[PDB]
Design an enzyme around this catalytic site. Structure first.
Site, mmCIF file in Angstrom:
data_model
loop_
_atom_site.group_PDB
_atom_site.id
_atom_site.type_symbol
_atom_site.label_atom_id
_atom_site.label_comp_id
_atom_site.label_asym_id
_atom_site.label_seq_id
_atom_site.Cartn_x
_atom_site.Cartn_y
_atom_site.Cartn_z
ATOM 1 N N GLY A 17 0.861 -1.230 0.000
ATOM 2 C CA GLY A 17 0.000 0.000 0.000
ATOM 3 C C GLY A 17 0.899 1.283 0.000
ATOM 4 N N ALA A 62 1.081 3.226 3.471
ATOM 5 C CA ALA A 62 1.901 2.500 4.449
ATOM 6 C C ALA A 62 3.327 2.424 4.084
ATOM 7 C CB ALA A 62 1.270 1.133 4.699
ATOM 8 N N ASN A 63 3.661 2.213 2.812
ATOM 9 C CA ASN A 63 5.057 2.158 2.446
ATOM 10 C C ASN A 63 5.805 3.446 2.677
ATOM 11 O OD1 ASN A 63 4.686 -0.497 1.295
ATOM 12 N ND2 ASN A 63 4.544 0.304 -0.779
ATOM 13 N N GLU A 99 -5.052 6.004 -3.430
ATOM 14 C CA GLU A 99 -5.449 4.691 -3.221
ATOM 15 C C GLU A 99 -6.585 4.531 -2.188
ATOM 16 O OE1 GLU A 99 -1.862 2.323 -2.341
ATOM 17 O OE2 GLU A 99 -1.723 1.732 -4.485
ATOM 18 N N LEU A 121 12.101 10.186 -12.195
ATOM 19 C CA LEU A 121 12.613 9.518 -13.394
ATOM 20 C C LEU A 121 13.107 8.085 -13.105
ATOM 21 C CD1 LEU A 121 14.837 12.558 -14.331
ATOM 22 C CD2 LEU A 121 12.487 12.162 -15.097
ATOM 23 N N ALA A 169 15.092 5.086 -11.606
ATOM 24 C CA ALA A 169 16.455 5.094 -11.020
ATOM 25 C C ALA A 169 17.304 6.202 -11.634
ATOM 26 C CB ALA A 169 17.135 3.705 -11.126
ATOM 27 N N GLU A 170 16.740 7.139 -12.412
ATOM 28 C CA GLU A 170 17.575 8.203 -13.111
ATOM 29 C C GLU A 170 17.419 9.578 -12.396
ATOM 30 O OE1 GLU A 170 16.842 7.411 -17.443
ATOM 31 O OE2 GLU A 170 18.029 5.635 -16.960
ATOM 32 N N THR A 187 21.221 10.732 -11.042
ATOM 33 C CA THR A 187 21.895 9.722 -10.179
ATOM 34 C C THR A 187 22.885 8.890 -10.964
ATOM 35 O OG1 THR A 187 20.097 8.104 -10.414
ATOM 36 C CG2 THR A 187 20.023 9.633 -8.533
ATOM 37 N N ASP A 241 7.907 4.801 -3.454
ATOM 38 C CA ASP A 241 7.310 5.088 -2.123
ATOM 39 C C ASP A 241 8.414 5.376 -1.102
ATOM 40 O OD1 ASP A 241 4.626 4.866 -2.934
ATOM 41 O OD2 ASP A 241 4.707 2.660 -2.726
#
Ligand SMILES: [Cl-]
Ligand code: NA
Ligand code: NA
EC number: 2.7.1.15
Lengths: 305, 314
Positions: free
Chosen positions: B43, B46-47, B144, B226, B228-229, B246, B259
């Protein structure tokens, strides 16, 4: 003291309903989820227990919330869980099912902790195995574990009811000789014999192959068309004109009504399976003794039916 | 003496992730056998709340689960992460939210979400949280739960002068205009920005043009992530896109990385209010990248004690 011991599987069915099935990479929002209790072994055990059998479920679930939930489901159905194992090494077995508005589905099965039920586990359960009246086994755990369960029952003179489901080509020959009652469906019989099975006549020819491999009694079920039976002393096919309900009921009758002919047991078990089919759901649809006709639990001479 | 006040309140979702790993994804009508099944706590609300808590935030999770075994289990998870469950509601009238997930050997997946009890989080349930919201530094909302419940949570925060961090995930075309005007920090990913703006988004350059549409709808700050960018940011006082990049790296499992990032940002907005946005985003990118190197979503989220001390300097 348990009269029917089942060595087999427990699985949790996790069902989501969606308008469409997802494409690769897609999240789709469903409109319904529900959980149902399954596994052939559990299901056969639950039907027998509901009919009034004293039963014990030898099986392995996870040391997880689904496994704790399963254990409670067995206890609620009055089944002994003394040899219901819990392991940290795998999850409780699961069947994940997604179904669209056209009734098309996808299904992912992970047998998980069921595959970890081993010899050492069965040995620990010797006391209940040796002392039962009927041992029931399927093919949803490691085949070698089922074999050894059948071999243990035989060494204590316990009656063996075996359901080779799901079937496998190249089944160990010892399976046939260890089975007092060997019961499977048409599709299963095709896998086991490599014959085609469409009619009751074909079924009878397939049963005879299996009978000649060493089974004492063979029963081939024909869906909602009844079943076909042969035995070593009566090799001629007899046609008697849900699967887990039927096998559970037959276990119950083998343990508690040995004075019934096979023909009568099979009638009663067909009847009880047909009740389960009418009611929505799966293990919850299995009928209790109190909700069935009292003739199902009387000697033939006691009733007028 | 005084209990620690919650600086971060997350009004949003909890769902149980039901994951099966398989060789290939099933085609229509197919039964396949998988190799492993994993339960996880998910969720987006929560995350995000869990990451913030692991970084050292005092957090309260306002959400609704079932009176089922999944909901009971979810409440214990929250407590094990030191999150207040004072307004984690349990209802007999629906089941806890689920995500039924199949993943293949390549990391491709199909997901079916059923919202369940998340939909039943209601106006009365928010009203009970009024004192906690009044004393918070940041309120975090997603999409959500019922869009009217998230809206109210954002208006509650705004009327109490609490900073609003809004993550329009999953996105929906024609989202109510109030959502932009009630967001102090509006953060979404590339695909989400396409849904919202009807523009394409592939590059960092496209991201910047999409962000400027969202900025003009009345957001104070917009961040487009983006993957992992890294990310791109704009603000009302600095409308020019900043690309915060990154290092390229092989992932272990990127599930839940988004999240992680939003939860890290909530932590910084609340506990480091004087950092520049540029610095907060760097630190949050870094934290999200750590999560990618471990499996299992919330389990992959890093604790303060396991992270480089520079993440907590002023
Ligand atoms: Cl109010
Ligand atoms: Na049924
Ligand atoms: Na990860």
């Amino acid at each position: 003291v348990a009269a029917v011991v089942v060595v087999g599987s427990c699985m949790t069915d996790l069902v989501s309903l969606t308008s469409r099935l997802p494409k690769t990479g897609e999240t789709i929002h469903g409109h319904k989820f529900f959980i149902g209790f399954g596994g052939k072994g559990a299901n056969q055990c639950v039907q027998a227990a509901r009919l009034g059998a004293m039963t014990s479920m030898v099986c392995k679930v996870g040391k997880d919330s689904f496994g704790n939930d399963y254990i409670e489901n067995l206890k609620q159905n009055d089944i002994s869980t003394e040899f219901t194992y819990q392991t940290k090494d795998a999850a409780t077995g699961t069947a994940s099912i997604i179904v669209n508005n056209e009734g098309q589905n996808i299904i992912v099965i992970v047998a998980g902790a069921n595959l970890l039920l081993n010899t050492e586990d069965l040995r620990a359960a010797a006391n209940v195995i040796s002392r039962a009246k009927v041992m029931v086994c399927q093919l949803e755990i490691t085949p070698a574990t089922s074999l050894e369960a059948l071999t243990m029952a035989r060494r204590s003179g316990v009656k063996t009811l075996f359901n080779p489901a799901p079937a496998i080509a190249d089944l160990d020959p010892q399976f046939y000789t260890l089975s007092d009652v060997f019961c499977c469906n048409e599709s299963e019989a095709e896998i086991l014999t490599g014959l085609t099975v469409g009619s009751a006549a074909d079924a009878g020819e397939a049963a005879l192959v299996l009978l000649k491999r060493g089974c004492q009694v063979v029963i081939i079920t024909l869906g909602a068309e009844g079943c076909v039976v042969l035995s070593q002393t009566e090799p001629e096919p007899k046609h008697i004109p849900a699967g887990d309900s039927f096998v559970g009921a037959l276990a119950f009758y083998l343990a508690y009504y040995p004075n019934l002919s096979l023909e009568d047991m099979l009638n009663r078990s067909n009847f009880i399976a047909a009740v389960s089919v009418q009611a929505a759901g799966t293990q919850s649809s299995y009928p209790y003794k109190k909700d069935l006709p009292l003739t199902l639990f009387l000697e033939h001479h006691h009733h007028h039916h």
